[PDB]
Design a protein around this motif. Sequence first.
Motif, mmCIF file in Angstrom:
data_model
loop_
_atom_site.group_PDB
_atom_site.id
_atom_site.type_symbol
_atom_site.label_atom_id
_atom_site.label_comp_id
_atom_site.label_asym_id
_atom_site.label_seq_id
_atom_site.Cartn_x
_atom_site.Cartn_y
_atom_site.Cartn_z
ATOM 1 N N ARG C 108 0.829 -1.192 0.000
ATOM 2 C CA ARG C 108 0.000 0.000 0.000
ATOM 3 C C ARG C 108 0.869 1.249 0.000
ATOM 4 N N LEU C 109 0.356 2.321 -0.606
ATOM 5 C CA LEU C 109 1.121 3.563 -0.697
ATOM 6 C C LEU C 109 1.342 4.191 0.672
ATOM 7 N N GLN C 110 0.425 3.958 1.608
ATOM 8 C CA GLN C 110 0.633 4.368 2.993
ATOM 9 C C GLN C 110 1.879 3.719 3.572
ATOM 10 N N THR C 111 1.951 2.397 3.453
ATOM 11 C CA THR C 111 3.043 1.641 4.038
ATOM 12 C C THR C 111 4.350 1.943 3.327
ATOM 13 N N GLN C 112 4.288 2.202 2.021
ATOM 14 C CA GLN C 112 5.498 2.487 1.259
ATOM 15 C C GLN C 112 6.030 3.881 1.555
ATOM 16 N N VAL C 113 5.140 4.865 1.708
ATOM 17 C CA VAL C 113 5.577 6.213 2.068
ATOM 18 C C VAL C 113 6.191 6.218 3.464
ATOM 19 N N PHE C 114 5.635 5.423 4.381
ATOM 20 C CA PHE C 114 6.258 5.311 5.699
ATOM 21 C C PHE C 114 7.604 4.593 5.626
ATOM 22 N N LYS C 115 7.692 3.536 4.815
ATOM 23 C CA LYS C 115 8.929 2.764 4.712
ATOM 24 C C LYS C 115 10.027 3.555 4.022
ATOM 25 N N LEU C 116 9.656 4.510 3.183
ATOM 26 C CA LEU C 116 10.676 5.250 2.459
ATOM 27 C C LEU C 116 11.196 6.445 3.228
ATOM 28 N N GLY C 117 10.707 6.671 4.443
ATOM 29 C CA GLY C 117 11.183 7.777 5.241
ATOM 30 C C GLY C 117 10.522 9.092 4.938
ATOM 31 N N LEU C 118 9.570 9.106 4.005
ATOM 32 C CA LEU C 118 8.873 10.332 3.640
ATOM 33 C C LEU C 118 7.947 10.800 4.749
ATOM 34 N N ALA C 119 7.422 9.874 5.534
ATOM 35 C CA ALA C 119 6.625 10.168 6.709
ATOM 36 C C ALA C 119 7.376 9.706 7.945
ATOM 37 N N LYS C 120 6.862 10.080 9.106
ATOM 38 C CA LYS C 120 7.509 9.699 10.349
ATOM 39 C C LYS C 120 6.676 8.776 11.220
ATOM 40 N N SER C 121 5.472 8.432 10.784
ATOM 41 C CA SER C 121 4.700 7.325 11.311
ATOM 42 C C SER C 121 3.809 6.821 10.189
ATOM 43 N N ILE C 122 2.971 5.835 10.498
ATOM 44 C CA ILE C 122 2.106 5.273 9.472
ATOM 45 C C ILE C 122 0.836 6.109 9.331
ATOM 46 N N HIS C 123 0.385 6.702 10.432
ATOM 47 C CA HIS C 123 -0.724 7.642 10.380
ATOM 48 C C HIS C 123 -0.300 8.937 9.724
ATOM 49 N N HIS C 124 0.952 9.334 9.937
ATOM 50 C CA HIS C 124 1.498 10.476 9.223
ATOM 51 C C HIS C 124 1.523 10.211 7.727
ATOM 52 N N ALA C 125 1.781 8.964 7.333
ATOM 53 C CA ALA C 125 1.727 8.581 5.925
ATOM 54 C C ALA C 125 0.319 8.704 5.358
ATOM 55 N N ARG C 126 -0.688 8.247 6.109
ATOM 56 C CA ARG C 126 -2.058 8.332 5.603
ATOM 57 C C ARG C 126 -2.509 9.773 5.456
ATOM 58 N N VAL C 127 -2.185 10.604 6.446
ATOM 59 C CA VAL C 127 -2.495 12.024 6.349
ATOM 60 C C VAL C 127 -1.789 12.644 5.152
ATOM 61 N N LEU C 128 -0.476 12.429 5.028
ATOM 62 C CA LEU C 128 0.316 13.068 3.978
ATOM 63 C C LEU C 128 -0.118 12.648 2.580
ATOM 64 N N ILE C 129 -0.650 11.434 2.428
ATOM 65 C CA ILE C 129 -1.248 11.065 1.147
ATOM 66 C C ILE C 129 -2.552 11.823 0.931
ATOM 67 N N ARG C 130 -3.385 11.913 1.974
ATOM 68 C CA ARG C 130 -4.672 12.590 1.832
ATOM 69 C C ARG C 130 -4.506 14.086 1.586
ATOM 70 N N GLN C 131 -3.371 14.658 2.008
ATOM 71 C CA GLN C 131 -3.094 16.086 1.899
ATOM 72 C C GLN C 131 -2.633 16.480 0.510
ATOM 73 N N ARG C 132 -2.484 15.509 -0.398
ATOM 74 C CA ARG C 132 -1.915 15.684 -1.741
ATOM 75 C C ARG C 132 -0.463 16.158 -1.695
ATOM 76 N N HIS C 133 0.344 15.487 -0.876
ATOM 77 C CA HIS C 133 1.773 15.740 -0.808
ATOM 78 C C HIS C 133 2.616 14.689 -1.502
ATOM 79 N N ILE C 134 2.023 13.591 -1.953
ATOM 80 C CA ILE C 134 2.767 12.453 -2.476
ATOM 81 C C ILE C 134 2.377 12.245 -3.925
ATOM 82 N N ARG C 135 3.374 12.168 -4.792
ATOM 83 C CA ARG C 135 3.162 11.784 -6.169
ATOM 84 C C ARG C 135 3.884 10.474 -6.415
#
Lengths: 73, 262, 180, 124
Positions: C108-135
């Motif tokens: 999942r893109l949530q888990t991948q954004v967290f694994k890549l260091g782009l976020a600092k937690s997994i909930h931070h990943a879900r928010v940051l995807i919903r915020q339109r910060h990830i392409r």
Amino acid sequence: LLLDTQQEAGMLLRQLANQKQQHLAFRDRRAYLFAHAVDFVPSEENNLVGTLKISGYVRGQTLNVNRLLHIVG
Amino acid sequence: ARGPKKHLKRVAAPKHWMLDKLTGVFAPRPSTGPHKLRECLPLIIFLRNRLKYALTGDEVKKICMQRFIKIDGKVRTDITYPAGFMDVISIDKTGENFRLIYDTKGRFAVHRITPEEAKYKLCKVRKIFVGTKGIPHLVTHDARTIRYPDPLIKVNDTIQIDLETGKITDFIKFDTGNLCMVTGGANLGRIGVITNRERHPGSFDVVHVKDANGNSFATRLSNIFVIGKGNKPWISLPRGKGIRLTIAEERDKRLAAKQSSG
Amino acid sequence: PVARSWVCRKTYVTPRRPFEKSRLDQELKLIGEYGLRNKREVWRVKFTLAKIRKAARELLTLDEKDPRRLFEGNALLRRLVRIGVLDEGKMKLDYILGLKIEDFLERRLQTQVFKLGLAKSIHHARVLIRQRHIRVRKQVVNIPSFIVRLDSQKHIDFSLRSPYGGGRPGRVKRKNAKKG
Amino acid sequence: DTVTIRTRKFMTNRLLQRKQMVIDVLHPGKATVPKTEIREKLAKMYKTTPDVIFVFGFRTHFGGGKTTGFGMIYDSLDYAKKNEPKHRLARHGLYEKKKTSRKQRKERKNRMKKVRGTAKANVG
RNA sequence: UACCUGGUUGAUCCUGCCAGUAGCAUAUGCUUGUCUCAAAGAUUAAGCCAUGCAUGUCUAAGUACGCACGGCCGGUACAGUGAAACUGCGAAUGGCUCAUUAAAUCAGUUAUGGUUCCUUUGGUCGCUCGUACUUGGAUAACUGUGGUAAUUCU
RNA sequence: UGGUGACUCUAGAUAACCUCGGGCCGAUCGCACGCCGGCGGCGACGACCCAUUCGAACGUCUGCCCUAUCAACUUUCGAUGGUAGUCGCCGUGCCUACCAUGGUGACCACGGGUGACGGGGAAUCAGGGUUCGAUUCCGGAGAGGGAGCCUGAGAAACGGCUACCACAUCCAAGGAAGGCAGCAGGCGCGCAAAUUACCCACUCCCGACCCGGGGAGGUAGUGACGAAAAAUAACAAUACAGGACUCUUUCGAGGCCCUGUAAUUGGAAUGAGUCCACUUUAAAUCCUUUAACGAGGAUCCAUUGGAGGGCAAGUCUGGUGCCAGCAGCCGCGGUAAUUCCAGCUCCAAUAGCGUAUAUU
RNA sequence: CUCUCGGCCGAAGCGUUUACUUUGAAAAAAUU
């Protein structure tokens, strides 16, 4: 419905004509009347009392004269 | 109903038109004409859905009424005109001639032909009768009747007709060892040499056809069109040479073309 | 008649037992670990894995040289290797049966954004995807349940129009910088 | 400046006297680019006057990058008036539609149906 | 996911049903921010309907004497656009509903060597040994006179 | 002559016929105009007849739910068959006449029922199965109920006509006009269902037709039937708190993460909304793209059901006192109620969740 | 499994007939 035009006025009149009428029971068992015109002639003005002429369309049951008449207020 | 139908829904249209599902309620109802509606192409589908010249049925009508489309050498302006098998379509303004010939998947390929080839066509004879003071007549699959044919031409043979005059040029007899296309059934669009026919009197004759790659199949006699003498053809062929690749080989060719062009 | 399509799917199944504590604990563990909204995300992933396993079971009953089995098995295994669940060495039809739900929750893109260091937690990943910060590649991706393909994984970035990408600081920073 | 016009699948329709194409528009910061300067950029790209070219159907993708629409370039303006649909001609002001509604002309049609002779022209 | 739990007794093991459990639809209650699709007067009443609309149509190529027209060039029979009307064609399709209907409908499978078929497409159309360099009478539109409370009446 | 598996087929030859309610064998229109006083090139309408297409119509073989409190049925008024005809587009008791006495049935006929239009299909499901299919594709049927017809290639047509029956409209009382099981709308009926909106731009259809028309169809409106995606916070520092790594006999000492309470702080990030514009489109709306404004918990405040067992989640506090009530089921309530009514708290699913009913 | 007509083969019957099994061609699209 929305009421802005004369076409919508005719549409609303057409709605109000053709509807399921809700029947109120207290209206239905007694003989009620809305007063369209009122005329008064006193028997004695010093008494401030006289006969009153209330004209309108009867609505409830058949109106019999022997029964009393209640004016609402 | 009380008389003939004039409409046709997209869902109940033939699947080889490759029509959509959500463009509309209706498909182009083909006209009555020289071909059956199940096994033809209306001119509008050819002229916008295959060739992408037009975008609407209005643009198709605009192209046709300028008299730029010729079918079998004659100008047709009906946009639902049924154009069918072995059919030459001439557009002289762009100077390009197509033939309607089947693909291996059962579908009418856009097959661009040279304008020398656009002078003739092949016809399978549906019946032969003598009539009217002893004069013989052919009836082909295009509802062409040709009076005075060769007495050697029998039913299920393929005559070659030039379109300008309309008369017979040269014929091929139905014989085991002659090249054929299949024009119906599951084997629609496959080309091979006839090895056998077996005759069932009072019923259908089943004709056996062997491919160039040795894959044998059978169809009914009514679904067989003779193309050439021996193993060579008398017309041009589409890109796939009439052989049906199994889906494994199609996947392999797809991946190889992916790997080659990157 | 209308020129509309009526075909549609339910993408999940609700379990038979409502209150079974083992299932409840396991599902909440999956939700809390991968930062999912509810139980239905778990049930959706479980439904997808069940369908893949049903297809593999149906292909295993067929003969080892059957054409349908070879073709559909190759397609099924290729799709499982492409998204990053199976590996190339373990690409056999009986290894599909060795697939778990956490394999699919990892792509999942949530888990991948967290694994890549782009976020600092997994909930931070879900928010940051919903915020339109990830392409992904060049497309801004708004969905967190987007399954990341394996070739697509190598460039998941910060969405040039984001504040964390190219620039243009946002509503709050613009307001706070316009104080003095 | 940053707006880009690129052209995908390209066709020369000699039967309808035009050039048909798919236009991709790259406008990374701005809104969906207006049709008028799409016609301007496409006129400078293809060396023809912008009054003979018609563009339509532009759908901006999610995120805010490309915008893909369909375009066509006519050989002459007379061929444009002969082949274009009337609404795409009226978007250039080259055509005008009647202002009567459908209802008005349906009722007029049936009212005229109720009479005969040149008294049809009287009623309306 | 090839699954069961409560309840007959002092307690037990059964038979056995009742109840729970999950889906799918119809209604209904409470609640409801965003977005993509999307069913929707079938069930009872194939009950009853105010109003409005749902079927019309001309090309260079059947019939033009409406100045209805800007308009030819003028003895130029008929310049052109053309209402109306006559003629032709379509209105047997489409749309709606499911009352009836039980080898009936229908489905697959075959027959017409037992029939008809506007249209499209191809053929055939001096194959007959017997006023024509063009026949006849009407009638619409239009002019005029009207009838009836009233009709797409006449 | 030619052909079929097979003709009483196709073609041939002869003798005649050839319907006045009659059969073909052109008194028709447009465009260009041109060559040895005459010939002509394309086309449009025509046309009996052969084929073709789109069909349609009668036949073949097999297949349908419940019922025996339906066991015999059919034939006087065709039931089954033969012969001749009639009629019909054609084959046939299709009708007639004259004959024969048949035809069907426990292998369920005949009769009745069906909250029965049939199929494609749908729900559920280990495997076998059960149930649904009014409903957009294919077929049939019908336009209030019957019946009869005109026209036509095609109709027993109903947005054609003629009656009768049942309703019902305008009347000057003589007469006249009707058919929403089309689209919208109304009444009624009920547990149960939308706008008297915009357009022929798309899909296609009709016509003499590149142009006219289309409640077909398309577009918006209503819409928690149902399906997909998906917000209602994220983070860092401090203060307590655990669990680990190092050093310590231990106590302990730290820089390693994690956790909530924060009646603690802090700025960052956003959409819901308000709103120019572009875009979309027949014209719009919506989505998408974009400026400006838009977030600290007294807000931009999540519900619905439960908390004895089945079945996840309290023997908490107040009220009630076999009452009021709960409780699908077992049961609770009669003065210490884990079950009622409440407060707090917890549990389950969640933009949804309860209940009734049919069905698996 | 084989006697006759045609080029070791094709035609002609087959073989008491089926039931069963395998193949082939036919079986609308949408749905799955």
